[model samples]
Target: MYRDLVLNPQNRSVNRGDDEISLTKREYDLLNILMTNMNRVMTREELLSNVWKYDEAVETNVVDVYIRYLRGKIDIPGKESYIQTVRGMGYVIREK
Candidate 1:
């Protein structure tokens, strides 16, 4: 679990203690990719290709937008962030 966010890939949802958050298909897949490769940074190209299956036609900024969306829902104010951005690299879900 990343903090209280317990990822349930089978249910396509995450449990924050008693609160359950349903994820969109894209969101679920994105979270799964991060968790499956925990502690490793994933570039926008990697995520775009893996999650969205997009090639050179797609803009990488979509990954950044979704990361922001995920952060808005999963991160609690005054707490450590679950998803971290590596400077000039990409994003990672660090192992606890």
Candidate 2:
């Protein structure tokens, strides 16, 4: 677990202390990838290819949309979110 974020890949669910966030398959996969590669920027293209298995040339905003959804679930009210966005780059889950 990183900080209060506990990801159970076995069930594809995450627990933040006493609060639990249920995830869709793609959301779980996205979170897993970000958690495993913490602190490193993962390009949107890379995420699209890995999560959806889309071609590198495929154009979609699904990654951004899902990231927003994940943030809403994982972040506590009025608290900073775990996922960090790098403009024109991608996203990252950094150590707390």
Candidate 3:
């Protein structure tokens, strides 16, 4: 768990405090990858391979979009985001 946010992959449920946050299949998949590799920056190329499985001609930019979606759902008001962007690199779930 990252602070008060907990991801239950088994039932595809995510909870922050007492609330359950809904997520799309792709969103869940993308999050699972990131959280699974928490604290490590994962490149868009790697995320694209796992999330899309190269199912289409989807580009790396799509990774940024879903990350936006993820933070939108999980971010706590007035708090820093759980996923941190590494400029010229990738993203990571780091708590400090």
Q: Please write out the lDDT profile of model 3 over residues 1-96, one tens digit for every residue.
A: 365667777778688889898889998999889888878899999999999994878999999999999999999889998788999789988756
**Which should have the higher lDDT, number 1 or number 3?**
3
Q: Per-residue CA lDDT of candidate 1, range 27-92, in tens?
A: 888888988888999999899989888555668898998888888778889988889999777899
Model 2 lDDT tens row, 1-77: 46668887778899888877899998999998998898899999889888989445545598999999999889888
Q: What is the C-alpha lDDT of each candidate?
A: 0.83, 0.86, 0.87
Candidate 2 stretches with Cα past 4 Å from truth are 54-58
Candidate 1 ranges beyond 4 A from true positions: 1-4, 54-57
Q: Name the better of 1 and 2 by TM-score.
A: 2
The local lDDT score (0 to 100) that residue 13 gets in candidate 2 is 92
Q: TM-score each candidate.
A: 0.85, 0.88, 0.89
Off by over 4 Å in 3: 1-3
How many clashes does each candidate structure show, in the order listed?
0, 0, 0
Candidate 1 backbone overlaps, count: 0
